[PDB]
Design a protein around this ligand. Structure first.
Ligand SMILES: Nc1ccn([C@H]2C[C@H](O)[C@@H](COP(=O)(O)OP(=O)(O)C(F)(F)P(=O)(O)O)O2)c(=O)n1
Ligand SMILES: Nc1ccn([C@H]2C[C@H](O)[C@@H](COP(=O)(O)O)O2)c(=O)n1
Ligand SMILES: [Cl-]
Ligand SMILES: [Mg+2]
Ligand SMILES: [Mg+2]
Ligand code: NA
Ligand code: NA
Ligand code: NA
Length: 326
DNA sequence: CCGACGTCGCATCAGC
DNA sequence: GCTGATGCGA
DNA sequence: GTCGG
C-alpha cells in the first residue's frame, strides 16, 4: 500500500498504548490516524501534509517526519528493546489474555509461549483455548475457504429450522479476499425486540454445528452471542485445515439492519460512524438508532427499513459494505 | 483549555 | 444468589 | 492523541 510504512508504525504505537500503557483512547486515536492515512490516495511526503487529515495531529505529524527521514521511530525502537513491553505485547496475542492479565503473568514470571504451556492451569478457559490454537489463529482465511465455511453454516442452520437466516458479515461481507475469522449474524422469527417465543435459539444452532464437528471449541456462549472455534473437514490423506475463530450473533429479527450494519464493520468504520451519529444528535448500537434529547438521553428507536436509512438519519451518503474497510 | 472519545455481550470478581 | 465493576472480546 | 466548542 502507498503509505504502509507509516500505517504500520501507527498501528504498532496503537498496540503499545493499548497493551502496555493501557490507554484505550490513545489506542483508538492511533488507529483512527492509521486508517485515515491508509485510505489517503497519495504517497505522503511530509508530516504537515498528513496533518491535514482528520485524526492526524501535531504529535503524529512529527513522528511521520521522523519516519520519512530515517525509516524508523526511535520511540518504537526503545519499546522494542524493553523486555516488559515486549513480553506484554506477546502475551496479549493469545485470545483472552488482555493487557491486565499479560502484566500479571509477566509479574509471575510467565512470559513466553513455553511458560504459558507449562502453566496451563493458571489460565481461564478462554485463555486455554487461545493458547491451544495460538498458531492457527494468526493464520488468515482465503475467501475460498470462507465460501466453504459459509456453505456448511448456512446448510446446517437450515437443517435445524428453515426459518433461520444466517448472514456472514465481517470482512467477508465487505468483499475481502481473506478474513481473520468468520462472523455469522443469525435471525429467527421467534426472536424479535418484542418477544422471545422460543428458547435455546442460539444453542440449537451451536449444537448442530458441534454435532457435524464444524464447531470444535467454545470460548464463551450466552443467549445471543457465541464465541468459539471451527474447522473445515479435510479430505483423505490431506493435512488438516487450521482451526478458525467463529463468532455467532443472534439479533432480533426486526432489528436486522442495525445488526448487520454493526457486524459488517469495520470496527473503525463503526466508531467513526457512531461518533458522527453523536455529533448529529443520535446514538447507534447493533439494535437501534435513537435520537438524543437536549437531556443527552436516548429517546425511542427510529424506524429503520434498510442499512441506508441509518446512513440517511445522520446525513451520510450510503456506503456499500466493500467501502467500509477503514 | 478540556471534556469527549462507540457500544455492548459474556466471564470473572468483589461486596452484600 | 444478585448487582455492579472490570476485563476482554465483537 | 485529536478534535471541537
Ligand atoms: N471493536 C470492535 C470490533 C468489532 N466490531 C464489529 C465490526 C466488525 O467488522 C465485526 C466483526 O469483528 P472482527 O474482529 O471479526 O472484524 P472484521 O471486520 O471481520 C476483520 F476485518 F477484522 P477480520 O476479517 O480480520 O475478522 O464486529 C466492532 O464493532 N467493534
Ligand atoms: N440474517 C438475516 C438476513 C436477512 N434478513 C431479512 C431482512 C430483510 O427483510 C431481508 C433482506 O434481504 P437481503 O438484504 O439479504 O437482500 O431479509 C433477516 O431477517 N435475517
Ligand atoms: Cl436499544
Ligand atoms: Mg471477522
Ligand atoms: Mg469529539
Ligand atoms: Na488533522
Ligand atoms: Na489477547
Ligand atoms: Na470475529
Amino acid at each position: 500500500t502507498l503509505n504502509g510504512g507509516i500505517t504500520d508504525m501507527l498501528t504498532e504505537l496503537a498496540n503499545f498504548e493499548k497493551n502496555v500503557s493501557q490507554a484505550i483512547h490513545k489506542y483508538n486515536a492511533y488507529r483512527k490516524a492509521a486508517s485515515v492515512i491508509a485510505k489517503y490516495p497519495h504517497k505522503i511526503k511530509s508530516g504537515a501534509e498528513a496533518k491535514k487529515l482528520p485524526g492526524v495531529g501535531t504529535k503524529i505529524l512529527e513522528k511521520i517526519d521522523e519516519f520519512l527521514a530515517t525509516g524508523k521511530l526511535r520511540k518504537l525502537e526503545k519499546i522494542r528493546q524493553d523486555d516488559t513491553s515486549s513480553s506484554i505485547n506477546f502475551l496479549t496475542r493469545v485470545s483472552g489474555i488482555g493487557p491486565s492479565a499479560a502484566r500479571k503473568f509477566v509479574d509471575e514470571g510467565i512470559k513466553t509461549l513455553e511458560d504459558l504451556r507449562k502453566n496451563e492451569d493458571k489460565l481461564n478457559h478462554h485463555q486455554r483455548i487461545g493458547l491451544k490454537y495460538f498458531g492457527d489463529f494468526e493464520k488468515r482465511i482465503p475467501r475460498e475457504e470462507m465460501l466453504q465455511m459459509q456453505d456448511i453454516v448456512l446448510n446446517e442452520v437450515k437443517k435445524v429450522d428453515s426459518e433461520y437466516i444466517a448472514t456472514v458479515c465481517g470482512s467477508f461481507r465487505r468483499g475481502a479476499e481473506s478474513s481473520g475469522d468468520m462472523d455469522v449474524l443469525l435471525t429467527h422469527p421467534s426472536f424479535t425486540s418484542e418477544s422471545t417465543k422460543q428458547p435455546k435459539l442460539l444453542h440449537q444452532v451451536v449444537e448442530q454445528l458441534q454435532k457435524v464437528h464444524f464447531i470444535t471449541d467454545t470460548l464463551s456462549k450466552g443467549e445471543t452471542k457465541f464465541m468459539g472455534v471451527c474447522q473445515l473437514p479435510s479430505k483423505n490423506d490431506e493435512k488438516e485445515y487450521p482451526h478458525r475463530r467463529i463468532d455467532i450473533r443472534l439479533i432480533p429479527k426486526d432489528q436486522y439492519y442495525c445488526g448487520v450494519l454493526y457486524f459488517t464493520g469495520s470496527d473503525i468504520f463503526n466508531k467513526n460512524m457512531r461518533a458522527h451519529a453523536l455529533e448529529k444528535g443520535f446514538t447507534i448500537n447493533e439494535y437501534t438508532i435513537r435520537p438524543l434529547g437536549v437531556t443527552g438521553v436516548a429517546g425511542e428507536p427510529l424506524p429503520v427499513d434498510s442499512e441506508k436509512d441509518i446512513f440517511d438519519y445522520i446525513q451520510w451518503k450510503y456506503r456499500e459494505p466493500k467501502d467500509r474497510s477503514e
